[PDB]
Amino acid sequence: AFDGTWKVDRNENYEKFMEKMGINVVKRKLGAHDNLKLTITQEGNKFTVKESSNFRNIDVVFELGVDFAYSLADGTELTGTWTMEGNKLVGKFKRVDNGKELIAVREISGNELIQTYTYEGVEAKRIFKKE
Numbered sequence: 482a483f484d485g486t487w488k489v490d491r492n493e494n495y496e497k498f499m500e501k502m503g504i505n506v507v508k509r510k511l512g513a514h515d516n517l518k519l520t521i522t523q524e525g526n527k528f529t530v531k532e533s534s535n536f537r538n539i540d541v542v543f544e545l546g547v548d549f550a551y552s553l554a555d556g557t558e559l560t561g562t563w564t565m566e567g568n569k570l571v572g573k574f575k576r577v578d579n580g581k582e583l584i585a586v587r588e589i590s591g592n593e594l595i596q597t598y599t600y601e602g603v604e605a606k607r608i609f610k611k612e
């Protein structure tokens with residue numbers, strides 16, 4: 482499953498995606514080399530994601546199908562839910578400032594974790610390798 486420690490390996494169109502979100506040139510360069518690592522653990526229907534990066538270290542806890550709030554490193558607030566679809570986790574979120582939709586998907590491909598995002602017509606991916 483998703484269980485395990487994952488470390489980012491490569492990105493696809495991440496800087497353009499961050500530009501759309503409103504992130505400055507400098508912060509995009511730092512964002513793209515954030516050394517993000519995720520430690521995922523499950524307990525029933527609830528997941529615990531320990532996010533660790535050059536920017537911060539925090540725990541994210543969520544129950545499938547129940548909305549929760551999550552903030553980006555820069556303070557941008559989102560609210561949404563994750564649900565299990567087939568073998569994938571599909572996340573439906575909204576920016577609380579502008580009300581715009583942001584979708585995220587987590588899926589396993591071989592031994593890699595692929596995280597895809599879409600926002601205002603732009604797609605980006607972050608691919609992680611298992612530790």
Ligand SMILES: CCCCCCCCCCCCCC(=O)O
Nearest residue numbers: 499504512530541551553585598
């Ligand atoms: C510099 C800003 C990068 C923005 C990337 C989009 C973040 C959306 C991901 C949603 C994650 C929710 C918490 C989780 O399940 O780990």
